Design brief:
This is part of a larger assembly, with 2 copies of chain A. By secondary structure, chain A is α/β, with parallel strands linked by helices. The first copy, chain A, has helices at 19-22, 39-45, 62-72, 92-96, 99-102, 123-133, 190-198, 206-209, 237-251; strands at residues 3-8, 31-32, 35-36, 51-57, 80-83, 109-113, 154-158, 163-168, 184-187, 268-269, 273-274, 286-287, 291-293, 304-310, 315-316, 321-327, 332-333, 338-340, 352-354, 358-360, 365-367, 370-371, 375-377, 381-382, 385-386. In chain A, a hairpin with a 2-residue loop joins β2 (31-32) and β3 (35-36). Chains A, B: InterPro entries: GMPPB_C, Mannose-1P_guanyltransferase, NTP_transferase_dom, Nucleotide-diphossugar_trans.
């Protein structure tokens, strides 16, 4: 057989929540746990030996993605390609558009997953589960509490045949503790199902007029996650999910994660830390848990880093403290300055976010606030949104 | 004699308060009372018959100013030129840099005024007052209350000779009810005074080490305003000062202001209104006081507009209301949707500001909030800052 993969990207109207960082780098390219957002789904595509072409679609500009796609295939050796849907049709019409380019190599199955998704990505397990199930698709599900039902709604699946018996997007009206995950896999027959709703019935939403109708007909199936999942449309969620990926890199191949845990010119690393080789460090700094340091960043001495992710070209000065923060590009953190937050992934100001080239002056404190790019701070801020 | 004028512009780090509008158009070019911010100072330069070259200096990019400067000299017939100070030195060092280009035509006096200033601009009166006083400069003052002293500080001037006896920028320590206005006029000898502080004494601030030292020495003079003045570093103040400019166009040449006051295919205009000829209007709309409408904007029927300024390409739908607001470029205001604010030029949310191409949907309300550019609003917001 042959397998193809298509990843949704979205346009500049979706990354309109990541604004401070979106102004420098679009949503899919924002580094999570050191690597861009979509860098982890693509990482799971190489484990499929019968997978070939990869397709990134979305009404962004190809100029931004062309430079990035050139570097991925140098690592995993997979033909990745970006396609700009001139007429964005959400999801269903997005992939029916240029259906020829995707089915150009007659792939048996086509992978369709979303950009803002944080699961374990068991692509080889769901592929084999779909080959046994058959039908069009197979979706993915995960057991959640019934109290966690306002986020999605209702989804019914018979655990004997693992078949989706009913699906309502938002009006739940009694649930079954099951919810969508966004990672789907179809067969080559999925493009024919869209023609019977775009040409026969005639802006088509995948999870409203395609997922809901295929209920009684034994074609839509399910497969449990049995791991983690967190929707990341919030810039604050970029930390809670970042810890899970590092935990994934601490279960599998932990040597890729920095584990100094001492002072032999190596700082005190307190587990679940990704340190880029291009960073500059001082042995007196304590790098706590859940911190993802990017390349070409200058870390000062005696600084404390927990529950944070730091972008490129940041300058950390003497005795700085960073808690529950996201430091932007080329940002400058003054000496004895503090940038903290509560850590509430439900509160808007629960994760303080710093824009590109924001200069926090010496002793200046930033507690749970959002600063835009190219900004200078001489005075301490708290519980505000600084433009 | 011969007179030259030099206007300060500032860079992208000064218009960092006008962010929603600064992202599309820099601070000096944002339309005040229908015309850009600096379009009012340049308008006052033509009344000086012995004036020649005009100089706009600031570390902005010339590409933005080259297109705008091409249109002004077509109106008032004055040679305007933009110069980008590669090394920004605040104010004093800015004009000492390329002092040759300024004194290229041997001007007797040089005008130096700032970008964010909203006065009556009596350039011909202060020029003649300077010729009588002599000395280096002549400044400008305005009688204010002693309670209004935290904004600036202290300034002493002897009313017999109108000579500045003492000057402290911020540490007031007893005041004299007089304050700077920012509009200055010097003689050709001013460049020599900078050499005695840049070369002899050796980032030089004009109003700290040049204005303060020239106190007892009879060279710094004063001249009363006797009109209006309002510092405009805030995007909210862009309305309070806009009303003064319209009143200036209501005292002088009021026919340039739209005065329909009826329904002969002309809407109900309630005084102090500037309507661009490129607008589309409906006679059922009530365009109240203090509104400055820009070009190529579509006004719907029965809409109410008071105390607000609207940028280009805005679309106003059925029965819309705009109070104490600033609507950005290409913005879309849905039908029966409302955009109001308190009007407190001291409160941050006293003037609600909408970014470029912000789409307020039908019935959606925005009360005292700030919306960024390229933003869609389906739900009403109130007392927030929407990113």
């Amino acid at each position: 057989e042959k397998v193809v993969a298509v990843i949704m990207v979205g346009g500049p109207t979706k990354g309109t929540r990541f604004r401070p960082l979106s102004f420098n780098t679009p949503k899919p390219l924002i580094p999570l746990a050191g690597q861009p957002m979509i860098h982890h789904p693509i990482s799971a595509c190489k484990k499929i030996s019968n997978l070939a072409q990869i397709f990134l679609i979305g009404f962004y500009e190809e100029r931004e993605f062309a430079l990035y796609v050139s570097s991925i295939s140098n690592e995993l050796k997979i033909p990745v390609r970006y396609l700009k849907e001139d007429k964005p049709h959400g999801s269903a019409g997005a992939l029916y558009y240029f259906r020829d380019r995707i089915m150009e190599e007659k792939p048996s199955h086509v992978f369709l997953l979303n950009c803002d998704v944080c699961c374990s990505f068991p692509l080889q397990g769901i592929l084999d589960a779909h080959r046994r199930y058959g039908g069009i698709g197979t979706m993915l599900v995960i057991k959640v509490s019934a109290e966690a039902a306002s986020q999605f709604g209702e989804l019914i699946a018979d655990p004997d045949t693992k078949e989706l018996l009913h699906y309502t997007e938002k009006p739940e009206t009694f649930v079954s503790d099951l919810i969508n995950c966004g990672v789907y896999v179809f067969t080559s027959d999925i493009f024919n199902a869209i023609e019977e709703v775009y040409s026969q019935i005639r802006f088509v939403r995948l999870d409203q007029d395609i997922l809901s109708p295929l209920a009684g007909k034994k074609q839509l199936y399910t497969y449990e996650n049995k791991d983690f999942w967190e929707q990341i449309k919030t810039p604050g969620k970029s930390l809670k999910c970042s810890a899970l990926y590092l935990s994934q890199f601490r279960e599998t191949s932990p040597h890729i994660l920095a584990s100094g845990d001492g002072t032999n010119r190596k700082p005190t690393i307190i587990g679940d830390v990704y340190i880029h080789p291009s960073v500059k460090l001082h042995p007196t700094a304590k790098i706590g848990p859940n911190v993802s340091i990017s390349a070409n960043v200058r870390v000062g001495p005696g600084v404390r880093l927990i529950s944070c992710i730091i972008l490129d070209d940041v300058e950390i000065k003497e005795n700085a403290v960073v808690i529950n923060s996201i430091i932007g590009w080329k940002s400058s953190i003054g000496r004895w300055s503090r940038v903290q937050a509560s850590g509430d992934y439900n509160d808007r100001l629960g994760i303080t976010i710093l824009g590109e080239a924001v200069t926090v002056e010496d002793e200046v404190a930033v507690i749970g606030s959002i600063v835009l790019q190219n900004k200078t701070l001489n005075v301490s801020v708290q519980d505000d949104i600084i433009l």
